[PDB]
Amino acid sequence: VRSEKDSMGAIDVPADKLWGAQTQRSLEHFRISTEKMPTSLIHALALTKRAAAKVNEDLGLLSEEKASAIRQAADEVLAGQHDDEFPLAIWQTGSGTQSNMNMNEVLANRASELLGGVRGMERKVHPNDDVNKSQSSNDVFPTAMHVAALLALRKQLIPQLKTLTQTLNEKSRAFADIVKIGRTNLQDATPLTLGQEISGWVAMLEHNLKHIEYSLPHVAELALGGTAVGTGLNTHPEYARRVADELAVITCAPFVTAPNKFEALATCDALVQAHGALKGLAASLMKIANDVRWLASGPRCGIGEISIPENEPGSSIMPGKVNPTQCEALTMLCCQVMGNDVAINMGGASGNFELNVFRPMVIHNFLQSVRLLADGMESFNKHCAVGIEPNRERINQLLNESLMLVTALNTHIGYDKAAEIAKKAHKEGLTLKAAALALGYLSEAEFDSWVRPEQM
Amino acid sequence: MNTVRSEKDSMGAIDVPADKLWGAQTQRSLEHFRISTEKMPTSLIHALALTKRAAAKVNEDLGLLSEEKASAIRQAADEVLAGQHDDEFPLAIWQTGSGTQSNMNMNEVLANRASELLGGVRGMERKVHPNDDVNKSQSSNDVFPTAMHVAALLALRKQLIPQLKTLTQTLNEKSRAFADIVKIGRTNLQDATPLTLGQEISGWVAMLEHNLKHIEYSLPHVAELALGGTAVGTGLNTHPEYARRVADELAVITCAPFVTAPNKFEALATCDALVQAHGALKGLAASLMKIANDVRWLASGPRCGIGEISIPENEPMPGKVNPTQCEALTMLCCQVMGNDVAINMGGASGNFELNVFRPMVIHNFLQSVRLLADGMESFNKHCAVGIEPNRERINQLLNESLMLVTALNTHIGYDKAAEIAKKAHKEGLTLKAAALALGYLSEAEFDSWVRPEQM
Amino acid sequence: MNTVRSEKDSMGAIDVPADKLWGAQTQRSLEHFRISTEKMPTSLIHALALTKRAAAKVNEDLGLLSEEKASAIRQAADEVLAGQHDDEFPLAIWQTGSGTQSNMNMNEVLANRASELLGGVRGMERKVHPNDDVNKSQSSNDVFPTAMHVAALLALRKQLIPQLKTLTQTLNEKSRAFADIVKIGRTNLQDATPLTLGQEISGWVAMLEHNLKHIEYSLPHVAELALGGTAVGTGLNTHPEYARRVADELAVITCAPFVTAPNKFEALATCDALVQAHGALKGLAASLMKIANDVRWLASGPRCGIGEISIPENEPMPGKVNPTQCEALTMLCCQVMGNDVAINMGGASGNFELNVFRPMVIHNFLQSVRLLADGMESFNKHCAVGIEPNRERINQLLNESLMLVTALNTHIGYDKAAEIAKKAHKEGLTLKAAALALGYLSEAEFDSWVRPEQM
Amino acid sequence: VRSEKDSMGAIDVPADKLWGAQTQRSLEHFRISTEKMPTSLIHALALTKRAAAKVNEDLGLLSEEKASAIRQAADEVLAGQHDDEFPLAIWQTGSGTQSNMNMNEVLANRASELLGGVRGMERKVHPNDDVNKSQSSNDVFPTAMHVAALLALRKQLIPQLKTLTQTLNEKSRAFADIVKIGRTNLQDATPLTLGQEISGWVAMLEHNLKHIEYSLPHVAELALGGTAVGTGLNTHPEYARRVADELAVITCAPFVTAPNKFEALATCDALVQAHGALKGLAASLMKIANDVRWLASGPRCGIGEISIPENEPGSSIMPGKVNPTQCEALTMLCCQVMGNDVAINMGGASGNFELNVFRPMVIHNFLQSVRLLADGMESFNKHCAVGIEPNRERINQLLNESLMLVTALNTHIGYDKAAEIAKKAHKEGLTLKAAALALGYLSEAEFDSWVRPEQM
């Protein structure tokens, strides 16, 4: 072990670790559950420190040697070299201070080594004085939250959403000619094509993309520069804009400094709103997944209008039972996003005065929902959606088995007469044609020429 | 009526419509909280009247109120209970969080009415006083919470439970009636091993029986009353026997096991009893959601769905029977789920000596009880009692499935059985047709060996 | 009225009170769905009337309905809009999930009323027919969803937004007015570095401005109407120009930018536009919750709380001013949160061509709009406009804190400043008293160096 | 790598791993997020397999050599020797089949080695035929869910709840004599003792324990024996009761076989109900945590009636700022439990016919809530509750600064006169005594003898 210290005294930290006294102290005070900061957030925090170092250097507040060393240490984190250096639980200080310090200590200790120094109290780079220069945990954590959120939405969620939409759009086009029985209130209704039904799914996904895009501008606003309470006390006048620009450059995302730092520090409003669009997407996906598994139900005693790829092995003596597992995984994660929204809403509604201190929990839920939806759509697309195929025989069997087509006969025979054969078919368990012919109201030839499902 | 009456309070005089029994404070509240359309539920109004009726009786017993004043207030409360003054409580749910305004609403109405009952008049020259007489030995802080529990316990005991038991009985009868009807099972929405319709329905019965016990376990906490704790729970300004006597009186007149809360601080500072009780209700909502969904899917058709059962057609596409009772029931189950979140939020928000999210909490709670009780009652009489099996459809499905292959194992071995199954599946044949095509058995043998009743 | 009228439908004859305008189907529904007390909101009833009014005009334009029949139906709808028939829609929210029963309720009322308007009579010998005339070119499946969006968009545009903008303006005025008042900051509920009251309030303003934009972004999806998609979205049984013309007509008469939905399948199969729009509302509820809480805590007292501001006392312990407007507002914010869950559940539950959780979804949505609009209106006029700072209290707090020590750093160095702070904290002294005790500076110097205005 | 296979063919699995073909297949098909099965569930599943092996042996369905080998492999899992052998995500098959197979493969491969055999297709113990004998994924997963839930509630949650209650009960007793100002609607109200206020917290915790205990009997019912659809097809008549008894013996918990297996398989009702009591506890804890942090707010511009231990270091120049971090961690996890309840409710309401397939998600949320509440109460107790101390001076200052005590004077002077001095004190900013004396209504001696706060 090694001995690191702070204003409360010294504490032993494992020698093979880059964190310091404050991280070790929190590690012993917040032993709650198993949830830790996700990688995306660790990376966003590293990026925030990297940008702060550059700007501080530009303003002459930090020496080139230290500034470059810090950025290099930050790049190592981004490169996956220090994943084991962030052991803190989500259930910590509500402001995220301890994760801010965790990063400050890891970066300082490593930066020291990079400068021919050593980790520990003999270090050349200081966590608070150097790595956290011109910052406050108060404005740093919210900044990291927005960076991680916007990048996750732009880099993961949106591309996956686009891909699944394209796949489903191809399917609607491919099945544009297949007429099937409609179902309203779960009952047989008027026909529509399989392609039309799928176009509904496509339109839902397209609308969702638009909604998600509308939430991005607010998430792009950064708190950095607000300092402790939003006033900006102890910062160079250009710091907030400069750091926002630097972040935009290195991430290639349109980040801007929050026009009102009081709103930025005192609330998690951008995320409460952005998540609203995410629970909206969860509801749409749930409906799509449900339609797929119900339409694929069977093989003999369900609907069975479509078939989906069998991805897991099944019993030799049970050929036919294909459980819609991708659909099951998708509906389960959709329920999760709904629950996650409630946790975020409660935390978001609970800020007091100058600062909202429910942040770690809010970001934990938000990033998980993005993760679930992005990976969920990817998995559903590759292992299910791309392989949806119609069971043409079943579809036609059902179509010709229903009484819904009697409508076409009305245009060629009085309402009551057409309804009459429908009553007999229904009562006798006969098909529309069998009933029609047996009732002697028409012949096979004229019936078949009158009942054209493809003409709606 | 356009004519007004000038009533007044600590803040001054204000006009009240002459034909109304409320006073100055109710008028002020009415004018300051014009938010939405939700008002106190009738059940809560009655619970408040009962609370005032009990407080009066005890105040009389303790020599705190005159016999005449006490009997007049008691009589006025009975009129409220008889439904003679439903038009006298115009306050919105979105008022003061302690429910103080509704407490005063009852105080003013009962005071003005009791005055007339004593040969007096309503208004500032009334013989009975809202605060001094009707609210004697009480506080809005401890009155509203008490009214909340009185309404909640009575609604659960008199409405919800009986309806739950009735539905359970109906389903139990159906379970026994269809005990011999074998149908195809469905897991993951896929065809599965057989079970009888009676066994499937018995699961619904067991769900409801389990729910009943959970609801019963929540009742004792709701039976605890805050009355007597006054402003902050210390019971400052009350007779030492008051809290106990008023609880006894309420118990006597309601025939419900009401008891004074052992810790008045917990009683005034939280809505914990209701947060927990509602947890049992959202559990019932989840169970009902599943039962209702099973029913509508099982009855889907008439030709392109499952169609194993038929349900009563209540409203006027020959066989298109929309499962409307199931639709009303599933919709209200979602409502109960949302109501739970609103209740949890309000329950988690108490500060120091008092939880001030009470009108909202009771609004949601009583709504969930109404929805579940009436929903079960409607679903039972308009759907459950008339559920009938479509035996022909059930048998058609059973015989067309590949799931009965299992019965052949002991007769021809697993390998041949699996071969028959694979062939039927690949060629779109029934098990019998595939079996006969292969020549592994005769039709007579298939008929004798494949007995779905021995699943 | 005890006297009945015999009305009939496909299912037969049923008695309807003679003094009512509804018909057989509304009576059946009324008797089958006696669940709770929630009925269709007035705003939804009016939206339905508007929808029927537009459908009639277009049917006339397309030569589908006679000029006389069309004008009579149009006139009947206007009466509904004028509030002349609020007693004619008794159906509960807990009915058929497609809203079919409320569609028929409007059809029957408009048919019976239009008949009288044509010199005819109500009942089975009416001149205007519910289905053939009033529901011409329509389906319950596409009518209810349309009425939902008409009500939702109008409520958001005419009620919610204006009230939001007004509150924002009031707070902005307060922000500018108190721009020079320095107060102690509070992070984690602990004393923190100073900021002005004006800056703190500007955060509330920015929150409301941001909320307005989010709400605006949700409007175009709500503006899409399902009318014309008929039973399953294919538009079977309608004129090819119908969907477009009816949307135009509604747009003309409402002055709202209504458009026909580009994909009718998405329109009939989901409530996605409302699930998303409500997401913006629950966001506003979270912001309002924080603003309301800040106000009540800042005004807590009068002696043992924060007491930095004073709020208007609206109802009648000398300085005990309960923050009732804040209490009503925080309670309704919890309601909006719960409503969101109910909406999400119903929205996620569509099956195939139709979402049948509609009455429940619109019930919750319109309630959240009413609550937020009226809540902001009430909070603004009865609280926000009269917020005043307690300058003496604010200054007392500032001077008693240890947070101003920072201003001494540039004059005496960090080490001495920290020493003064530690001493004051350990001994329960003010910074000045500790500074003077140590002799690090004179009172004149402290007074000149510690300028809170330069924070 | 090694080559394992199933009915879909062969697939390579890392040689140094004990899982098989089906686990490897799922690993590639369900790459969703980062959530995996928690240790408590893995252990419960191992325990379920251990019990099944014993009973199967007792009924002669399995040979002693294989049965003992399986139990030994199971014990190794319980001992923490194979944590890295369960890589499957929560977002998998809704029935939990893939986790059931993961355990079957790990146990079979290891059991083979224990019998002088080898892992892989050459194994002496077979995953399906031996380890899963007399079972079905359908009834095995629900059983594992209940075992993990009941044990977590009994072994972790309840003891922590009891401990925190005892600590707070000691505090109420200790501060039974300290009179303070009450607060209703956040406004100054009539006095009560600090001990009384704390007794309220104690009573809340005691009521919650009762509620949690009421939910245990239903959770104790096990699905094992129901088989695929609840009928029990393919099992010895005594199997269900025997396995339930065995489980009771090895865990020392009162497990019983579910009286109705259809209810047990088709729903997650016991957990929906049990979680109801947990969200109830979250609401109570939230209120307690909030009271503590508000009462400790300050040090100069808040309430400051109590002080709590400072666990993290602070600025040298800012002595006094003690952020209530344990309270912040506790309120954050409470919001989480509320959100978790919604996800569970949606999954619980979504069963279809014979089986509810939202199980992995339900158990994931349930176990997390237990974890959060148990660890949260432990942390709050040790690092905050045990160290709550009153700031007697502040408490008295506030008490004597309020106008609420004017009530005592009423009993010694007319309502209006007492109210009169209250008006002056309030208007002039004077204390009750200063106003009373200046108004000449009484003397210091008689005032002090009349205004006795300790007499309520």
Side-chain angles (χ1 to χ4, degrees), chain C residues 109-397:
Chain C
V109 168
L110 294 190
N112 278 334
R113 184 54 182 153
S115 180
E116 297 189 331
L117 256 32
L118 290 183
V121 68
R122 67 179 68 172
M124 296 328 296
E125 63 182 3
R126 52 191 161 225
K127 297 183 53 181
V128 179
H129 307 310
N131 253 279
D132 295 327
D133 299 319
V134 191
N135 202 63
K136 198 170 206 55
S137 306
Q138 301 150 62
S139 166
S140 296
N141 294 0
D142 70 339
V143 175
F144 203 76
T146 297
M148 284 170 73
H149 283 22
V150 173
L153 190 61
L154 297 182
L156 285 170
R157 289 167 51 86
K158 300 172 66 60
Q159 298 159 39
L160 197 295
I161 292 174
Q163 295 311 142
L164 176 54
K165 285 179 170 180
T166 298
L167 181 56
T168 303
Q169 188 201 132
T170 297
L171 261 9
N172 195 236
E173 290 172 6
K174 292 290 173 171
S175 175
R176 294 186 302 101
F178 311 145
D180 70 299
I181 306 178
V182 181
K183 48 158 283 170
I184 198 67
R186 290 178 182 85
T187 51
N188 311 83
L189 307 183
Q190 297 288 111
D191 304 350
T193 172
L195 77 165
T196 71
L197 185 53
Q199 287 171 142
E200 187 173 55
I201 296 179
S202 76
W204 301 346
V205 174
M207 290 163 74
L208 295 180
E209 294 176 327
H210 273 98
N211 271 290
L212 175 57
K213 291 134 196 56
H214 288 289
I215 292 167
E216 291 179 328
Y217 296 146
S218 75
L219 308 185
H221 195 352
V222 182
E224 300 187 1
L225 309 179
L227 203 63
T230 67
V232 301
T234 59
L236 207 214
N237 295 132
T238 43
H239 186 96
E241 299 174 73
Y242 181 72
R244 175 187 56 93
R245 303 177 108 129
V246 70
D248 283 335
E249 180 59 20
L250 277 168
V252 167
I253 66 189
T254 65
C255 302
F258 286 112
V259 304
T260 193
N263 192 103
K264 295 301 193 292
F265 308 98
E266 174 263 352
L268 297 186
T270 77
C271 295
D272 286 0
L274 295 182
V275 173
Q276 290 277 353
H278 198 88
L281 298 179
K282 57 86 160 181
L284 175 63
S287 294
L288 289 177
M289 180 92 75
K290 202 269 174 175
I291 296 170
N293 275 324
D294 272 3
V295 171
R296 58 169 174 185
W297 279 106
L298 248 26
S300 63
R303 296 288 179 84
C304 313
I306 297 186
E308 286 175 0
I309 63 173
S310 57
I311 58 175
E313 187 174 17
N314 298 297
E315 306 90 40
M317 299 164 251
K320 190 178 198 290
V321 179
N322 291 342
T324 57
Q325 290 297 145
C326 291
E327 294 172 2
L329 192 54
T330 54
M331 283 195 291
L332 66 87
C333 287
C334 294
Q335 193 64 231
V336 171
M337 238 62 102
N339 291 355
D340 190 75
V341 175
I343 286 172
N344 294 346
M345 282 191 63
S349 307
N351 290 122
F352 310 116
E353 285 50 74
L354 196 71
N355 178 297
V356 294
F357 285 79
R358 298 179 175 285
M360 181 278 294
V361 170
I362 197 57
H363 164 69
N364 285 96
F365 191 93
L366 292 180
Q367 184 182 259
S368 299
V369 174
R370 287 199 302 276
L371 292 170
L372 294 169
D374 295 353
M376 288 191 278
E377 180 175 37
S378 189
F379 179 79
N380 173 259
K381 69 176 76 292
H382 301 312
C383 186
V385 297
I387 289 177
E388 287 298 321
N390 290 328
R391 299 180 184 249
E392 12 69 56
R393 175 61 160 174
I394 290 172
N395 273 295
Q396 182 216 320
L397 292 185

Side-chain angles (χ1 to χ4, degrees), chain B residues 106-419:
Chain B
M106 184 58 72
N107 285 336
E108 291 173 341
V109 168
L110 294 190
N112 278 334
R113 184 54 182 153
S115 180
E116 297 189 331
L117 256 32
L118 290 183
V121 68
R122 67 179 68 172
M124 296 328 296
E125 63 182 3
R126 52 191 161 225
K127 297 183 53 181
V128 179
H129 307 310
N131 253 279
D132 295 327
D133 299 319
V134 191
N135 202 63
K136 198 170 206 55
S137 306
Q138 301 150 62
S139 166
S140 296
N141 294 0
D142 70 339
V143 175
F144 203 76
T146 297
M148 284 170 73
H149 283 22
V150 173
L153 190 61
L154 297 182
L156 285 170
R157 289 167 51 86
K158 300 172 66 60
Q159 298 159 39
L160 197 295
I161 292 174
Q163 295 311 142
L164 176 54
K165 285 179 170 180
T166 298
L167 181 56
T168 303
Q169 188 201 132
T170 297
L171 261 9
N172 195 236
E173 290 172 6
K174 292 290 173 171
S175 175
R176 294 186 302 101
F178 311 145
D180 70 299
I181 306 178
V182 181
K183 48 158 283 170
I184 198 67
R186 290 178 182 85
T187 51
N188 311 83
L189 307 183
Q190 297 288 111
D191 304 350
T193 172
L195 77 165
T196 71
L197 185 53
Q199 287 171 142
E200 187 173 55
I201 296 179
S202 76
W204 301 346
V205 174
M207 290 163 74
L208 295 180
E209 294 176 327
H210 273 98
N211 271 290
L212 175 57
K213 291 134 196 56
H214 288 289
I215 292 167
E216 291 179 328
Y217 296 146
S218 75
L219 308 185
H221 195 352
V222 182
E224 300 187 1
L225 309 179
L227 203 63
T230 67
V232 301
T234 59
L236 207 214
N237 295 132
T238 43
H239 186 96
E241 299 174 73
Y242 181 72
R244 175 187 56 93
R245 303 177 108 129
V246 70
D248 283 335
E249 180 59 20
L250 277 168
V252 167
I253 66 189
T254 65
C255 302
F258 286 112
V259 304
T260 193
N263 192 103
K264 295 301 193 292
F265 308 98
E266 174 263 352
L268 297 186
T270 77
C271 295
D272 286 0
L274 295 182
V275 173
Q276 290 277 353
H278 198 88
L281 298 179
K282 57 86 160 181
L284 175 63
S287 294
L288 289 177
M289 180 92 75
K290 202 269 174 175
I291 296 170
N293 275 324
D294 272 3
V295 171
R296 58 169 174 185
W297 279 106
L298 248 26
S300 63
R303 296 288 179 84
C304 313
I306 297 186
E308 286 175 0
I309 63 173
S310 57
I311 58 175
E313 187 174 17
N314 298 297
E315 306 90 40
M317 299 164 251
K320 190 178 198 290
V321 179
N322 291 342
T324 57
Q325 290 297 145
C326 291
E327 294 172 2
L329 192 54
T330 54
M331 283 195 291
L332 66 87
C333 287
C334 294
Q335 193 64 231
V336 171
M337 238 62 102
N339 291 355
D340 190 75
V341 175
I343 286 172
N344 294 346
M345 282 191 63
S349 307
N351 290 122
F352 310 116
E353 285 50 74
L354 196 71
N355 178 297
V356 294
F357 285 79
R358 298 179 175 285
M360 181 278 294
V361 170
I362 197 57
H363 164 69
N364 285 96
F365 191 93
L366 292 180
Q367 184 182 259
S368 299
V369 174
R370 287 199 302 276
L371 292 170
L372 294 169
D374 295 353
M376 288 191 278
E377 180 175 37
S378 189
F379 179 79
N380 173 259
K381 69 176 76 292
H382 301 312
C383 186
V385 297
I387 289 177
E388 287 298 321
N390 290 328
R391 299 180 184 249
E392 12 69 56
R393 175 61 160 174
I394 290 172
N395 273 295
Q396 182 216 320
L397 292 185
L398 261 184
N399 300 339
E400 280 177 8
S401 71
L402 307 173
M403 290 309 306
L404 307 179
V405 66
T406 309
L408 301 177
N409 287 34
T410 54
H411 300 108
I412 64 177
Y414 179 100
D415 299 304
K416 279 172 175 166
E419 183 178 8

Side-chain angles (χ1 to χ4, degrees), chain A residues 2-5 66 108-113 115-127:
Chain A
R2 167 178 79 253
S3 178
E4 294 236 11
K5 68 182 290 67
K66 286 185 163 182
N109 272 333
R110 178 61 188 153
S112 182
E113 296 187 331
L115 294 182
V118 64
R119 63 178 67 167
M121 308 317 296
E122 194 184 308
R123 69 198 156 206
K124 302 183 185 301
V125 184
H126 305 84

Side-chain angles (χ1 to χ4, degrees), chain C residues 186-191 297 300-304 317 320-323 327 397 400 402 409 414 422 424 429, chain D residues 183-188 294 296-298 300-301 316-317 319 321-324 328 398 401 403-404 422 425 430:
Chain C
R186 290 178 182 85
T187 51
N188 311 83
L189 307 183
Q190 297 288 111
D191 304 350
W297 279 106
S300 63
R303 296 288 179 84
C304 313
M317 299 164 251
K320 190 178 198 290
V321 179
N322 291 342
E327 294 172 2
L397 292 185
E400 280 177 8
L402 307 173
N409 287 34
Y414 179 100
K422 283 180 176 56
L429 307 174
Chain D
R183 290 181 185 84
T184 53
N185 311 84
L186 304 187
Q187 299 287 108
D188 308 347
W294 277 106
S297 61
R300 304 289 180 89
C301 319
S316 190
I317 205 169
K321 182 142 165 58
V322 175
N323 295 334
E328 291 171 2
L398 288 178
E401 207 173 64
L403 300 321
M404 291 305 303
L430 280 35

Side-chain angles (χ1 to χ4, degrees), chain A residues 183-188 294 296-298 300-301 316-317 319 321-324 328 398 401 403-404 425 430, chain B residues 186-191 297 300-304 317 320-323 327 397 400 402 405 409 414 422 424 429:
Chain A
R183 290 181 185 84
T184 53
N185 311 84
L186 304 187
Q187 299 287 108
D188 308 347
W294 277 106
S297 61
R300 304 289 180 89
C301 319
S316 190
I317 205 169
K321 182 142 165 58
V322 175
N323 295 334
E328 291 171 2
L398 288 178
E401 207 173 64
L403 300 321
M404 291 305 303
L430 280 35
Chain B
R186 290 178 182 85
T187 51
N188 311 83
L189 307 183
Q190 297 288 111
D191 304 350
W297 279 106
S300 63
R303 296 288 179 84
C304 313
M317 299 164 251
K320 190 178 198 290
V321 179
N322 291 342
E327 294 172 2
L397 292 185
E400 280 177 8
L402 307 173
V405 66
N409 287 34
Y414 179 100
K422 283 180 176 56
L429 307 174

